[PDB]
Every structure is written in C-alpha cells, then in structure tokens.
C-alpha cells in the first residue's frame, strides 16, 4: 500500500535496532546453550505447524525468547516454559484465532500447569515491558518481495525458508539484524531459483548492496548447504509441503560467485 510503504520500512529499521537481543547472551547463561535453543526453536516450528500458526507468530516468539534470555538466566528445565509462554504471547498478538492456553499446556505433554504458563506469560510481558511489535525477518522479506519481476512464488517460499532457517542458530545469526538476514535470504533465493541478483531498487530502498550483505550471505549460504545434515529438521520437513511449493527440495548453488 505504497502510501505508507517507505515510512514503515523506515520505522521498522529504527525499531529493529531497539528490539535486537544481545549477541553474546548465551555465554551468560550458565545452564543453557545455543544447542538447546536450537532444540527449542525447532519445537516451536512444529508447534506452529501442529496448530497451523502464521510464520509471523513464529518470528515474534523467537524474538521474544531471545530478548527474554538477554536479561534473565533460566534453568534448562524451564527453557520450554519460556518458549511456550512466548508462543502464546505471539499468537495472541498476531493470530486471528490464538490457540487456547490449555492447548499450550497440552503440546508440552503436561510438563507445565496452566498456572505456570500464565505466570510465565506475565513475567515475559514484564520483562519486555510490552514491546511486542517487533520487526521480523518475515516482515522485511514481504516488503522486499514487492520488488520482484515478476513475482515468483518459488522465490518467495524459498526466502521465507532460509529466513526461517536462520532463527535456529544464534551463532551466528544473533549478530545480524532482521533486515540484513532478509536481504541475504531474498538474494539467495532469487539467485538459487532464477539466477538473478539482489536488485537495484532494493539498493535504493534499503541502502544495502551485495557487498554490505556479503557476511550474513556467506553464513546463510553455508547454512543452506549444510541444512540436510543439521541436528534440527523441522523446517526442512515443514518446507517439503506444497503450502510452501516444496522449496526445501530445491538444490542450493555450490557457489554464489560474488
């Protein structure tokens, strides 16, 4: 709706810096690692598919978990509790029909009570001070997508998928902003599917070039090449679905020749 297209892009650029989690964080959590987190985000992916949630809800919940864990140490036994209250907050925020709290207690296999999930819900809101409208990778991709010629649904799903892949690994994806991961994701997809590259108009729009997108893009490319071997597979499975044009079955380029 190009009356406000640029204004929003701008505002989201400013907000993505304020909602950035801290890059180190995991080093300060005595009882958790980047691997358990990966285990957790993979699980939110299946919860999203089990309950049929938007990919947006999924991006927001991970943003809530990362910010929450930038400031609260948590024991390994409560990580899923945090993850679950996050998913619920994201759903209430983003979904037309959020799953019910009990359903959230139910996919944990009664690991937590309704009471604990509700109490967790409230602490997450306190800790985030209700700043829930966070820019995500999904929201940048969607805008970048208006820049296609012509639109290409395989391109769209594959960018979404690469962007989803980046949610799984804090090292190194925490060090990049959502708009940057989205550029690297959009470019890889375009290039993988059609051989085209990050377009001039997205340069005028974002101020980013392949040169500025390079680092994240080098990481995102290894992530994509290594994806079949990753301990987490829910996103790949997920993306074998025709809802997503089965794009996880495509083959990554061996080189990106930059």
């Amino acid at each position: 709706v190009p009356d406000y297209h640029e204004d929003i892009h701008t505002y989201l650029r400013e907000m993505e810096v304020k909602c950035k989690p801290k890059v180190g964080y995991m080093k300060k959590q005595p009882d958790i690692t980047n691997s358990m987190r990966a285990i957790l985000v993979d699980w939110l992916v299946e919860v999203g598919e089990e309950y049929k949630l938007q990919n947006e809800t999924l991006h927001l919940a991970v943003n809530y978990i990362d910010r929450f864990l930038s400031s609260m140490s948590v024991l390994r036994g409560k990580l899923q509790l945090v993850g679950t209250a996050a998913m619920l907050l994201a759903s209430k925020f983003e979904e037309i029909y959020p799953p019910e709290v009990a359903e959230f207690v139910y996919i944990t296999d009664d690991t937590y009570t309704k009471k604990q999930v509700l109490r967790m819900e409230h602490l997450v809101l306190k800790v985030l001070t209700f700043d829930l409208a966070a820019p995500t990778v999904n929201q940048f991709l969607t805008q970048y997508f208006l820049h296609q010629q012509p639109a290409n649904c395989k391109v769209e799903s594959l960018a979404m998928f690469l962007g989803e892949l980046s949610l799984i690994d804090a090292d190194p994806y925490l060090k990049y902003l959502p708009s940057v991961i989205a550029g690297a994701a959009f470019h890889l997809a375009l290039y993988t599917v059609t051989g085209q590259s990050w377009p001039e108009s997205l340069i005028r729009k974002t101020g980013y070039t392949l040169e500025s997108l390079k680092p994240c893009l080098m990481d995102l490319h290894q992530t994509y090449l290594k994806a079949p071997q990753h301990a987490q597979q829910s996103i790949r499975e997920k993306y074998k679905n025709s809802k997503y044009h089965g794009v996880s079955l495509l083959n990554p380029p061996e080189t990106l020749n930059l």
């Binding site: 299946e46 390994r76 139910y106």
Partner: peptide, 9 residues
C-alpha cells in the same frame, strides 16, 4: 511428536 517435553540434560 510435538506433544513432548523437550529433553536437554
């Protein structure tokens, strides 16, 4: 299965 408490130890 989704229905599962995640194991981490």
């Amino acid at each position: 299965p989704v229905k599962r408490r995640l194991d981490l130890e």
